[PDB]
Design a protein around this ligand. Sequence first.
Ligand code: HEM
Ligand SMILES: O=C(O)c1ccc(-c2cccs2)cc1
Ligand SMILES: [Cl-]
Length: 393
Amino acid sequence: TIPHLAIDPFSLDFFDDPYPDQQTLRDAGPVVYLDKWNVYGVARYAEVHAVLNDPTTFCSSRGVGLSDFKKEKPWRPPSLILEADPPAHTRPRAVLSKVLSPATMKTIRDGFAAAADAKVDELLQRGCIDAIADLAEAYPLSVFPDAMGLKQEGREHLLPYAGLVFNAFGPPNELRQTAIERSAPHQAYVNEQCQRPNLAPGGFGACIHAFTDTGEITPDEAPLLVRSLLSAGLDTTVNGIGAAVYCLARFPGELQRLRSDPTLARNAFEEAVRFESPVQTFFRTTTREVELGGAVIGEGEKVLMFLGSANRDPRRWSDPDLYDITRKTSGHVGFGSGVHMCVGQLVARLEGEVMLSALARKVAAIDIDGPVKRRFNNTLRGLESLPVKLTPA
Ligand code: HEM
Ligand SMILES: O=C(O)c1ccc(-c2cccs2)cc1
Ligand SMILES: [Cl-]
């Protein structure tokens, strides 16, 4: 009933160009079995969306990586939000929602926007730059650690820690094993910064600790919730902004439309999130036998969702392989869907919007002018190096 495929979605070949294999996975059926890892897979929009929106049946508390927490020990203490199901998920989620809330974005927008304009002005003085190290990495590093309230010392641990976290959702391949081998100094730094005395007043970390007297979380839960923002809050945005710049570099007609109406900046970023999907895949575990898209899956089985594939599924999207900054993007799954849908999406969209606004107002052309190099991670998609020449408007 269910087709068995040998495709390895965690292989370097797949990362280098996932799109043909994703079509093969979608077209094989609504539910496939991946023999390489003994997991079920769903690559169509319909089933990805259905799985995400049934957290009772497709739970997160057994881990959102390949590893089943009922069978193996997690590599670090489980996240109180990502790796929790309702009702345990609900109150920590509400705290992070209020910490990263629509109202909070007002307190940071002016500074985030000025830093984006400043970075684009700096890059234009150099002309030829690496849009990864010099922009996609440099911009979030210039705003997010400060908004968290982190001290300056030790910030070089943040991107390695995040890469470790996202590699650790994969199978026990070399990318994952090597990340864990190297992890001790990054875990040590990150855990220490999560303690209340190490988080500057007014930042996101201090605000999480301030919620420990309302009855929503206790003091001993706050450090792990700070850990969540230090895990998911930087490397995702690096790959999102890198994706947007890569899209504008490859589709100059869309850069021209963005220049002509900079208020398209926010949707141009959302479309980049759909088109490249910085978070490509992750898992749920079944809590019962379940029928999904006409197939029967037993209890206790890992189900791999292909978010990037769902975002390119022609059953859902017109011209899915085109980057279109005026596309109606509502419904894409690049930030997830349902109860776990990205709690930091307003921070991500703010960074992306203000960066693309700066480019729209200040840059006339973005031309790739060197070898493009991909960065390999078990669940994040993005580039290692993107040499571009920026021409001023
Ligand atoms: C372009 C940038 C980003 C992308 C593509 C992205 C993607 C996602 C996705 C797909 C999920 C759902 C995971 C699941 O259902 O298991 C998620 C959850 C989450 N994200 Fe984001 N994210 C981004 C930025 C951020 C930022 C900036 C923050 C914090 C400042 C953040 C914090 C979180 C947290 C804490 C969760 C867990 C929420 C929950 O389990 O209820 N993310 N993100
Ligand atoms: O530590 C945390 O709570 C944490 C939360 C979310 C993530 C993401 C996984 C996949 C997309 S976002 C990773 C870590
Ligand atoms: Cl840790």
